[PDB]
Structure 1
Amino acid sequence: EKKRIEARQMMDGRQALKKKHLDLLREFHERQFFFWYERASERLQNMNL
């Protein structure tokens, strides 16, 4: 029983770490969108010509 409860707790800790790394990935992907916006905004200006 002790081993089983330890395994369950380890799974929960893994889920917590997954949430943390998902937050990190969200922050990373927001930054990469900024590159896309700057590149895309300049191109659309040309299309107005």
Structure 2
Amino acid sequence: EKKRIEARQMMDGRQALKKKHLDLLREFHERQFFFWYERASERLQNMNL
């Protein structure tokens, strides 16, 4: 039982870390989209001419 509760706490910690990893990946994707918009804007400006 003691080992069981220890493993349960470890799994809760790992699940929380996985959720934080998903959040960080979301932030990274948003940053990449922000950079892409800045880069793609000028190409459409050139394509507008």
Query: TM-score band (shorter)?
Result: 0.7 to 0.9
Runs of 4+ in 1 over 2 A off after TM superposition: none
Q: Distance in 1 between matches of 2:37 and 2:20?
A: 26
- Residue 11 of structure 1 deviates from its aligned partner by 0.7
Distance in 1, Cα, partners of 2:30 & 2:9: 32
Q: Deviations over 1:13-48 (max 9, x none)?
A: 100111122212222221121111011111012222
> Where does residue 46 of structure 2 map in the other structure?
46
What is the TM-score with the length of structure 1 in the denominator?
0.75
Identity of aligned residues (%): 100
Q: 1:10 & 1:42 partners in 2: Cα distance?
A: 49
For residue 2 of structure 1, report the CA deviation from its aligned partner: 1.3
TM-score (norm 2): 0.75
- Rounded to whole Å, the distance in 1 between the matches of 2:39 and 2:24 is 24
Aligned-residue CA RMSD in angstroms? Answer: 1.4
